[PDB]
């Protein structure tokens, strides 16, 4: 009754929040895959060094 356009503004704000949160979710997943590849990469690198540590 009193906050009709106010709640419309809230609807817009939550829509923007949904957009930013989707970008966060997506980009964090992207970085998760990135980090996992580089983690397993250097992991196995350490494993090879951990097994046959050169002179």
């Amino acid at each position: 009754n009193a906050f009709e356009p106010a709640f419309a503004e809230l609807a817009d704000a939550v829509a923007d929040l949904e957009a930013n949160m989707m970008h966060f979710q997506l980009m964090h997943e992207s970085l998760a895959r990135f980090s996992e590849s580089f983690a397993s990469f250097l992991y196995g690198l350490n494993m090879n060094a951990f097994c046959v540590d050169f002179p």
Binding site: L45, N46, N48, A49, F50, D53, F54
Partner: protein
């Protein structure tokens, strides 16, 4: 007959000489470049594993 065989030998010599020199010069220069490339390559990877050892 005699000189026919002499020049037969000479023609074979010179023919295969041109072939061998082509082989020699071209592939030698090429392989020298390849050698230095492989040198720097293996050295870089060697140091990579060196740093991995220090990482351990």
């Amino acid at each position: 007959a005699v000189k026919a065989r002499q020049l037969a030998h000479l023609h074979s010599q010179l023919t295969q000489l041109s072939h061998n020199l082509a082989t020699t010069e071209n592939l030698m220069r090429m392989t020298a470049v390849q050698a230095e490339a492989m040198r720097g390559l293996g050295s870089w990877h060697a140091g990579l594993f060196m740093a991995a050892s220090k990482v351990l």
